[PDB]
mmCIF file of C-alpha atoms in Angstrom:
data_model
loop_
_atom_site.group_PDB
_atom_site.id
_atom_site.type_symbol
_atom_site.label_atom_id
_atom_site.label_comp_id
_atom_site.label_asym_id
_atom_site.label_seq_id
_atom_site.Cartn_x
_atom_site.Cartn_y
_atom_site.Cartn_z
ATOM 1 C CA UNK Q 1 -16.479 8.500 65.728
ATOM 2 C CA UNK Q 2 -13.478 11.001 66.547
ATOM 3 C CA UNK Q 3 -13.378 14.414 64.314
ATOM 4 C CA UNK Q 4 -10.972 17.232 64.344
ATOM 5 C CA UNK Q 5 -12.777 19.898 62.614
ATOM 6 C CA UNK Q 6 -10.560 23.254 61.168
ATOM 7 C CA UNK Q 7 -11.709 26.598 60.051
ATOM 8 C CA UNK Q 8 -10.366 27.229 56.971
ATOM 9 C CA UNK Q 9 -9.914 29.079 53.534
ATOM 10 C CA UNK Q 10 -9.310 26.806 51.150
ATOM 11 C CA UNK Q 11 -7.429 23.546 50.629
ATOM 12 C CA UNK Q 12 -5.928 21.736 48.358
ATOM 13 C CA UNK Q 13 -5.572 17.073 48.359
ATOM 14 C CA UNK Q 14 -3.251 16.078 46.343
ATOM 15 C CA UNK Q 15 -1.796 12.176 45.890
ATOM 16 C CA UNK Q 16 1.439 10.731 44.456
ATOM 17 C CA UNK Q 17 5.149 12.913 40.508
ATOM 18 C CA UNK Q 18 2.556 14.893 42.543
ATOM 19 C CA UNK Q 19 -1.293 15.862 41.625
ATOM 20 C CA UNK Q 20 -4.457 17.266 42.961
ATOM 21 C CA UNK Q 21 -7.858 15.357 43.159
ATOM 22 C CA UNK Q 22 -9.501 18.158 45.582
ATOM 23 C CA UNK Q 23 -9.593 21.767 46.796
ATOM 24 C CA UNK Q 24 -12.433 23.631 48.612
ATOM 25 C CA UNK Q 25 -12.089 27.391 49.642
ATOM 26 C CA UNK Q 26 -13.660 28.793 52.508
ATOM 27 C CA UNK Q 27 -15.394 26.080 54.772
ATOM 28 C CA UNK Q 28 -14.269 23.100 56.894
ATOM 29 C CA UNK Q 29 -11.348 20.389 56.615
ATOM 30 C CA UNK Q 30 -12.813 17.773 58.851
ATOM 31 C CA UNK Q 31 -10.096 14.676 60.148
ATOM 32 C CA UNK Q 32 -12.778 11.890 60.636
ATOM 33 C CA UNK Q 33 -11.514 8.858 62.278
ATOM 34 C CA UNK Q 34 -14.007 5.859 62.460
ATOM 35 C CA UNK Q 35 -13.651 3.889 65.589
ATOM 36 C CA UNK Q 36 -14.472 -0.527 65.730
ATOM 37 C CA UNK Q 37 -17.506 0.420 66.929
ATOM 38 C CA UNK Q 38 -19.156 3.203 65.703
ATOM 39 C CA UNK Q 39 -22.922 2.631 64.959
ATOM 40 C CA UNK Q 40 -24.780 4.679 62.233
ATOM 41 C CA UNK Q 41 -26.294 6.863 65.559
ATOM 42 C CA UNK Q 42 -22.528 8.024 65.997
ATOM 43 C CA UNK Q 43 -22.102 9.186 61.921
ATOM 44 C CA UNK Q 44 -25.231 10.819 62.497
ATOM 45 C CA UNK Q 45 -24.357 12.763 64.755
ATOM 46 C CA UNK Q 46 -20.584 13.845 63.611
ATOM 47 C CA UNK Q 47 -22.446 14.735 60.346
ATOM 48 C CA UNK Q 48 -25.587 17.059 61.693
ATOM 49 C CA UNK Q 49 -22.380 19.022 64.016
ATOM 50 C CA UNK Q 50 -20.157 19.309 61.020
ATOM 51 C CA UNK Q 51 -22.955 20.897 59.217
ATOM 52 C CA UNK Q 52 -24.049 23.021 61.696
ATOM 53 C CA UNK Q 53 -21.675 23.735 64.281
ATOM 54 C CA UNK Q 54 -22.165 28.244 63.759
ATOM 55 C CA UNK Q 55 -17.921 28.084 63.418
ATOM 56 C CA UNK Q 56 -18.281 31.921 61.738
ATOM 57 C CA UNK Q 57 -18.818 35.464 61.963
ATOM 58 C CA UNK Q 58 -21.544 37.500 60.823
ATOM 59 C CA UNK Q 59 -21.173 40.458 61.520
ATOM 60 C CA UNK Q 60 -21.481 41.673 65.426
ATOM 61 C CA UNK Q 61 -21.837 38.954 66.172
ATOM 62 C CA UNK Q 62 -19.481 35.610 66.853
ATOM 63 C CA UNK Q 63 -20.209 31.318 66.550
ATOM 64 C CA UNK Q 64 -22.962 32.642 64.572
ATOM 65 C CA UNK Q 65 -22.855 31.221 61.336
ATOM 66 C CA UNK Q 66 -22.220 27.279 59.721
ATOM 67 C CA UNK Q 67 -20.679 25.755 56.816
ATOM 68 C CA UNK Q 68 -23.832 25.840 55.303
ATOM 69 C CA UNK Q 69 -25.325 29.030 56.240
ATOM 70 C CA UNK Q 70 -22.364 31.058 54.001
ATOM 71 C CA UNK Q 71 -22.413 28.508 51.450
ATOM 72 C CA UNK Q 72 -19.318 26.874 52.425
ATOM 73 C CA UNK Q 73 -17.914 23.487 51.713
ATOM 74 C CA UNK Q 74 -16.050 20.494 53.467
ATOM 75 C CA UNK Q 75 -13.534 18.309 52.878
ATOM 76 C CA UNK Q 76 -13.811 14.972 54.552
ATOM 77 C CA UNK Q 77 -10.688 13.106 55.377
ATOM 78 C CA UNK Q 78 -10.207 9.554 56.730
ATOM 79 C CA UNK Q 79 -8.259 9.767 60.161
ATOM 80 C CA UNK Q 80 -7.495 6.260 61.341
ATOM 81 C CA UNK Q 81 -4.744 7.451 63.546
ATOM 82 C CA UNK Q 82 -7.467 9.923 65.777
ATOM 83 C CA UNK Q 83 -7.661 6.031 67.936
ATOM 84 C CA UNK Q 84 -3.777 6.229 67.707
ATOM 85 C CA UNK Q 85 -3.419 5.702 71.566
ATOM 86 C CA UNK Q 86 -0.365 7.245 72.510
ATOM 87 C CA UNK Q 87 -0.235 6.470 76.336
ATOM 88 C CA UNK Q 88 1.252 2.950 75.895
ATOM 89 C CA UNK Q 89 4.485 3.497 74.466
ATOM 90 C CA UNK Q 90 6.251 6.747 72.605
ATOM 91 C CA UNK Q 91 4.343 4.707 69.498
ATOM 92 C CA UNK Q 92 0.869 4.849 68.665
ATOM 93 C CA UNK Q 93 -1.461 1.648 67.358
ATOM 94 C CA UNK Q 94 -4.382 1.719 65.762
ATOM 95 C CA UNK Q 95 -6.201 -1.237 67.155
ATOM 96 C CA UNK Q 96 -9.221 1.036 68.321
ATOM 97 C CA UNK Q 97 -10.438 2.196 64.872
ATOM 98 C CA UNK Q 98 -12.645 0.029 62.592
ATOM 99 C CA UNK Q 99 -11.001 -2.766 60.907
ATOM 100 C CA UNK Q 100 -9.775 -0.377 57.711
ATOM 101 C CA UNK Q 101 -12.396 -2.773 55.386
ATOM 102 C CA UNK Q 102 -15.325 -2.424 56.005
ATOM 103 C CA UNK Q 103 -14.839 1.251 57.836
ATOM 104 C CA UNK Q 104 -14.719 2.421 53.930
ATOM 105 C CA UNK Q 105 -17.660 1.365 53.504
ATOM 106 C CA UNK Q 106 -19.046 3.011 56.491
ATOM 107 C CA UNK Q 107 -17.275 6.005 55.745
ATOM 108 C CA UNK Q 108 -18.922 6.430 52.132
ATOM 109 C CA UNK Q 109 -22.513 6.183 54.007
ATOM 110 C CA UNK Q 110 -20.913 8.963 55.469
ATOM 111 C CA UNK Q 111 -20.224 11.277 52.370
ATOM 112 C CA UNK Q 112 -23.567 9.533 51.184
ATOM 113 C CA UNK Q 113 -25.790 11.101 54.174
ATOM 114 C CA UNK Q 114 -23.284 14.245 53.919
ATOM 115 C CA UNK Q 115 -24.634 15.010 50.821
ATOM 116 C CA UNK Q 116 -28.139 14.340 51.580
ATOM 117 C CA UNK Q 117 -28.124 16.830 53.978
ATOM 118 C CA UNK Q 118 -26.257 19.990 52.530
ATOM 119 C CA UNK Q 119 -26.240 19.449 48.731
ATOM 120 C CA UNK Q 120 -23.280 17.164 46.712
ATOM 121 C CA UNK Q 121 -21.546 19.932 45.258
ATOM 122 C CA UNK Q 122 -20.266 21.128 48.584
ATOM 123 C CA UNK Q 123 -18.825 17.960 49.907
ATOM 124 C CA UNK Q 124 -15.090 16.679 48.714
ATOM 125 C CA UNK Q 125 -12.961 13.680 49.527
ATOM 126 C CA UNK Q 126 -9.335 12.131 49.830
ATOM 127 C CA UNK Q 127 -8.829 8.932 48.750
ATOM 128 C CA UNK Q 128 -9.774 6.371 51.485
ATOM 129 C CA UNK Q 129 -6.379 5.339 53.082
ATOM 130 C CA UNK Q 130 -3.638 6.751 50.527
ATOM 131 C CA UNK Q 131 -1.232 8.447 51.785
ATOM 132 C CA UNK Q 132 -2.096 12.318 50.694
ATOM 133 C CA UNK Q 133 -0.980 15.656 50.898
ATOM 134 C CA UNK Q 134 -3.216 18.729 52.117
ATOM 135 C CA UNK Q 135 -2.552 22.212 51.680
ATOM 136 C CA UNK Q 136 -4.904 23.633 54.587
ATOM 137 C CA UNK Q 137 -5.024 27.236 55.074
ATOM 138 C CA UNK Q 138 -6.018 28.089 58.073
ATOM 139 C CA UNK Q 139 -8.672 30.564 59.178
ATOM 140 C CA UNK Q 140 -8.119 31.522 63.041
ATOM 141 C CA UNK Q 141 -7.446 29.294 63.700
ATOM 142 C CA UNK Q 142 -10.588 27.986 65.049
ATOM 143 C CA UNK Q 143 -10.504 24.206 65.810
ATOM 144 C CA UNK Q 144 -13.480 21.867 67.385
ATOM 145 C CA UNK Q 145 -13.243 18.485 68.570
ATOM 146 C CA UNK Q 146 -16.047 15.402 68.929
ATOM 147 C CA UNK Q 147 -15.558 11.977 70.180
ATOM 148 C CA UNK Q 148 -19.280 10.661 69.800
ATOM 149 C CA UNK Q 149 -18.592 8.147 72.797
ATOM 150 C CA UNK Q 150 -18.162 10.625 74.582
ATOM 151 C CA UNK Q 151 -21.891 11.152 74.815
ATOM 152 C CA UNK X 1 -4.680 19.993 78.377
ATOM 153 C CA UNK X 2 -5.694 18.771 74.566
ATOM 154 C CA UNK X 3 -3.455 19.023 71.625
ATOM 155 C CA UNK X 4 -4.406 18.201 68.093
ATOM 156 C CA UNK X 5 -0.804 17.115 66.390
ATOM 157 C CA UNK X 6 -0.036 17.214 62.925
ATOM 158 C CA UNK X 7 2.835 15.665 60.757
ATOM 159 C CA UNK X 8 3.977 18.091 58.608
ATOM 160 C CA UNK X 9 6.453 18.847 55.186
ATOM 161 C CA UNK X 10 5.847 22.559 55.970
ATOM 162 C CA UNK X 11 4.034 25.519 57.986
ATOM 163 C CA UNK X 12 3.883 29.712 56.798
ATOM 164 C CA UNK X 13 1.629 31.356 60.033
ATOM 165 C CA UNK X 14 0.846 34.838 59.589
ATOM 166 C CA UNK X 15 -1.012 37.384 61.597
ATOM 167 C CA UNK X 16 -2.160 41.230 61.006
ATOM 168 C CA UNK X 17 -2.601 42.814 54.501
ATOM 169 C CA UNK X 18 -0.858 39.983 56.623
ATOM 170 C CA UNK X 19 2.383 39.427 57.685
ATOM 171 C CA UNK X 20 4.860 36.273 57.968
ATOM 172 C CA UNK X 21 6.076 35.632 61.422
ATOM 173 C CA UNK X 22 6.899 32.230 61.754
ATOM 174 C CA UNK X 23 7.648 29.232 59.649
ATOM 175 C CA UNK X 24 8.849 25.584 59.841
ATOM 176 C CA UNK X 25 9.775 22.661 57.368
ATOM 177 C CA UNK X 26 9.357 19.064 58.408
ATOM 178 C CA UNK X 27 8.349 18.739 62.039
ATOM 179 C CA UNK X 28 5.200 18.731 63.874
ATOM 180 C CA UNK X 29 2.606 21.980 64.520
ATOM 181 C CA UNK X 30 0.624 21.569 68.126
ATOM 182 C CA UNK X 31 -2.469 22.876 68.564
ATOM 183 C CA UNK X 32 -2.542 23.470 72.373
ATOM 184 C CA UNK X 33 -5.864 24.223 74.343
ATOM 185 C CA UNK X 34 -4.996 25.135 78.154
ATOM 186 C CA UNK X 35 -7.672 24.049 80.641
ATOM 187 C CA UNK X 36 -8.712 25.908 83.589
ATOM 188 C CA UNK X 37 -7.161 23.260 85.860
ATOM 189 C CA UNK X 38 -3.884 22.359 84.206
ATOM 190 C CA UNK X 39 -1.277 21.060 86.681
ATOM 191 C CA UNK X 40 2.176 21.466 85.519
ATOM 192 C CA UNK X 41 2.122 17.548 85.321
ATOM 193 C CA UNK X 42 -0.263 18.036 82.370
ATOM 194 C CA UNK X 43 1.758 20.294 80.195
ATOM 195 C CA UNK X 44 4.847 17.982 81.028
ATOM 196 C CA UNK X 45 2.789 14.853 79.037
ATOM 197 C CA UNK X 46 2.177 17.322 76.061
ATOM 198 C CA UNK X 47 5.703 17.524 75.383
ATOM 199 C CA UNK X 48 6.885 14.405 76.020
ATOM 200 C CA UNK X 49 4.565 13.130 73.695
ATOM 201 C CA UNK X 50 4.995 15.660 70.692
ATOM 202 C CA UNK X 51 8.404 15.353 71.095
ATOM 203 C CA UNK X 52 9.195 11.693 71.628
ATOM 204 C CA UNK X 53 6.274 10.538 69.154
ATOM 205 C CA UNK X 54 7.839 8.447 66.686
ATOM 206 C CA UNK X 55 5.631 9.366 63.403
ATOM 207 C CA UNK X 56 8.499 9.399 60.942
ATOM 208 C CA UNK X 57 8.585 6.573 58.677
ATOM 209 C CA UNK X 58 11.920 5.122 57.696
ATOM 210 C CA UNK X 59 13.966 2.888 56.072
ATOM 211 C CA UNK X 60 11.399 -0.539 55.953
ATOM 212 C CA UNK X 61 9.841 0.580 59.687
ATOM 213 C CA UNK X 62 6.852 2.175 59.998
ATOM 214 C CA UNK X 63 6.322 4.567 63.238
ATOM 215 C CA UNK X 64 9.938 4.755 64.170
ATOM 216 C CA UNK X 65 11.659 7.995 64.507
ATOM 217 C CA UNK X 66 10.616 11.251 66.477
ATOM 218 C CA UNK X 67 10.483 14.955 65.749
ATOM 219 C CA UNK X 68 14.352 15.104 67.278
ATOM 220 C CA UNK X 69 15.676 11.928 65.633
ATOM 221 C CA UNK X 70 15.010 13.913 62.739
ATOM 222 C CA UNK X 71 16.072 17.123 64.141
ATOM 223 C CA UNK X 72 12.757 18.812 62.722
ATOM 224 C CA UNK X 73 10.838 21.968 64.081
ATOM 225 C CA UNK X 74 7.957 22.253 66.159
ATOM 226 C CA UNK X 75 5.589 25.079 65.072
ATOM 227 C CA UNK X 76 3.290 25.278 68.384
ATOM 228 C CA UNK X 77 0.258 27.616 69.107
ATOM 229 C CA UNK X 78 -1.908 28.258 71.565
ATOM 230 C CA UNK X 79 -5.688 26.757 70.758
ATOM 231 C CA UNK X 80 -8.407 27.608 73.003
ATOM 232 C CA UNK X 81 -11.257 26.072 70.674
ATOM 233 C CA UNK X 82 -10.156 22.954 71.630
ATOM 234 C CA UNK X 83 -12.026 23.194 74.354
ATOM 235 C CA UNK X 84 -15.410 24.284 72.586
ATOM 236 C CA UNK X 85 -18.639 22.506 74.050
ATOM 237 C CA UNK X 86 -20.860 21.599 71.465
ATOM 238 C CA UNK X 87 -22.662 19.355 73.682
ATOM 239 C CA UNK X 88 -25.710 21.895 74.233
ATOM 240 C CA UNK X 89 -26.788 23.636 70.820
ATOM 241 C CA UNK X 90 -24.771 24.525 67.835
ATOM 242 C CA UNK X 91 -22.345 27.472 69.217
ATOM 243 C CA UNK X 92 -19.725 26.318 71.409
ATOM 244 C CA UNK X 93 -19.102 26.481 75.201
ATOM 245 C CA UNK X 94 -15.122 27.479 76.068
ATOM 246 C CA UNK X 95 -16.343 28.005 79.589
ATOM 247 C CA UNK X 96 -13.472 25.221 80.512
ATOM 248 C CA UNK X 97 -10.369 26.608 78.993
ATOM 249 C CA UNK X 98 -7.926 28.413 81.068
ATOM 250 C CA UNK X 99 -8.318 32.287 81.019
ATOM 251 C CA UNK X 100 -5.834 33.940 78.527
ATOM 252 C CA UNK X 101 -3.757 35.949 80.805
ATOM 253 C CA UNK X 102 -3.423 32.876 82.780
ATOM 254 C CA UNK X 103 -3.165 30.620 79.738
ATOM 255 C CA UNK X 104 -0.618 33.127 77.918
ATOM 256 C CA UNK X 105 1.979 32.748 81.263
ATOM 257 C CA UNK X 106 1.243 28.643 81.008
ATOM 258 C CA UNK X 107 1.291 28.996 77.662
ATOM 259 C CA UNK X 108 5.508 30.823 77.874
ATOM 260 C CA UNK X 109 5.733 28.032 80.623
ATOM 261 C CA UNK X 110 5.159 25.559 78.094
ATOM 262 C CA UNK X 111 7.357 26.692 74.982
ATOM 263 C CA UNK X 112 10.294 26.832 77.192
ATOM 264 C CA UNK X 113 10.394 23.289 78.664
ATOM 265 C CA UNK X 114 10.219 22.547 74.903
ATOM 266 C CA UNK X 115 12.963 24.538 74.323
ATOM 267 C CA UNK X 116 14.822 23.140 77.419
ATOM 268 C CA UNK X 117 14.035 19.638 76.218
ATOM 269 C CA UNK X 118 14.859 20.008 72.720
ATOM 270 C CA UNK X 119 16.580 23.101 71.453
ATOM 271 C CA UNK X 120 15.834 26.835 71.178
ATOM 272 C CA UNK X 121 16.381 26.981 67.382
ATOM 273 C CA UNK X 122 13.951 24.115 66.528
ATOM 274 C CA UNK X 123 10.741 25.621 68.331
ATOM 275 C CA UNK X 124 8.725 28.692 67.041
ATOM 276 C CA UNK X 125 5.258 29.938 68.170
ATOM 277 C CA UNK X 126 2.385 31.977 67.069
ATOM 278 C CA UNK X 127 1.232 35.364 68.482
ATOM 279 C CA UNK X 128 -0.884 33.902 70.983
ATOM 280 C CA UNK X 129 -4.436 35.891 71.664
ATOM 281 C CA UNK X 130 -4.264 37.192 68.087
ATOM 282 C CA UNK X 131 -5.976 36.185 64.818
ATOM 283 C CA UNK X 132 -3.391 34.173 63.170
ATOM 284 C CA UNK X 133 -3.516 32.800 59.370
ATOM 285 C CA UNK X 134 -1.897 29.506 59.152
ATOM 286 C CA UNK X 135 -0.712 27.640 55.638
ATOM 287 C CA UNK X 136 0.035 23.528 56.517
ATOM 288 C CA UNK X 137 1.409 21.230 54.109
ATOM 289 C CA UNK X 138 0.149 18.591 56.135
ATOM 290 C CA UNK X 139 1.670 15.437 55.021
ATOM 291 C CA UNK X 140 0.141 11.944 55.545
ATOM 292 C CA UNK X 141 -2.209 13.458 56.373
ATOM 293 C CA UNK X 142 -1.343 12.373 60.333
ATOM 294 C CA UNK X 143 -3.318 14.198 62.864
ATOM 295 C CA UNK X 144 -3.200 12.759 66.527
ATOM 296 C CA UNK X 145 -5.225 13.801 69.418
ATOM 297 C CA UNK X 146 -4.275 13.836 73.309
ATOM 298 C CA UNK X 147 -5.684 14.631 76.678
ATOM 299 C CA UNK X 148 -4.216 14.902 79.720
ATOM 300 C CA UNK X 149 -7.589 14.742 81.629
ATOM 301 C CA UNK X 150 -7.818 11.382 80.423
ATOM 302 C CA UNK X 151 -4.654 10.202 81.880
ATOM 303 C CA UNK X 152 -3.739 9.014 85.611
#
């Protein structure tokens, strides 16, 4: 699993004669892009670093603190283009992440466990594969990168 | 060098309340991490890519036109994070990104082959080294990730 993860203060999802579904304040925007073969192991793991990765300040001190810690929230957003290799051509495909099907499915196991973990009233959504429109504001801006395979 | 790319309607960054310095409308905004061992060849790929990516849809084609087909901006800043290490514990490791004084010059270095390659006027930056506030409309949303480590 790929995620781009953003420091931010709030942010607002909004879908198509345009309207909003979601909007956290202070916390994370995280672009998760599921790739063909991601395991459960590799959710896992994106998951326990999204929640815990010490992204803020508390006072003297810095990388201290996590989404959860300051009673933040995040906003989990479907990436598929994160596979988007662009070394071929000046065009990107998307043949490297999960056949966009059955990655849905992985992806609410995702939000499932996400909740699980921190509680559900901290954890928001896009919907899976529409084309949407985020106002993120960002907060830095401070901006962390996993690819699970990686490791 | 990494750069997380985003398609965007729209960006308003602002830095130290605050105060507007910089703001596109349609375009791309590159978030550039240096690394300690960037060849010029590296930040040449960068470039190439953000501006020749075609992530425009149009006219019954998907993934067509570029950021200068369309003759859009390019809000770019610098992004050390990027090169956080989360690989040991939960507070990140940017023991691998270029050093600022010697990521600020590469940084310059960097904005102006944009400019040479594209056009002044279409090309803004932050205030790198400084907290910045930045608002995206981020539209798709469309967020690509490169790295020229990764490459020949």
């Amino acid at each position: 699993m790929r995620v781009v993860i953003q420091r931010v203060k709030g942010a607002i999802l909004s879908v198509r004669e345009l309207e909003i579904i979601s909007e956290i304040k202070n916390g994370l925007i995280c672009f998760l892009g599921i790739h063909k073969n991601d395991t459960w192991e590799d959710a896992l793991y994106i998951i326990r670093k999204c929640l815990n990765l010490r992204l803020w300040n508390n006072d003297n001190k810095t990388w201290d603190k996590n989404v959860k810690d300051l009673n933040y929230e995040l906003l989990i957003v479907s990436q598929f283009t994160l596979f988007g290799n662009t070394k071929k051509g000046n065009k990107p495909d998307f043949h490297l992440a999960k056949e966009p099907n059955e990655a849905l499915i992985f992806y609410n196991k995702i939000i499932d466990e996400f909740k699980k973990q921190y509680n559900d009233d901290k954890i928001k959504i896009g919907k899976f594969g529409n084309y949407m429109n985020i106002d993120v504001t960002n907060d830095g801006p401070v901006t962390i990168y996993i690819d699970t395979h990686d490791i």
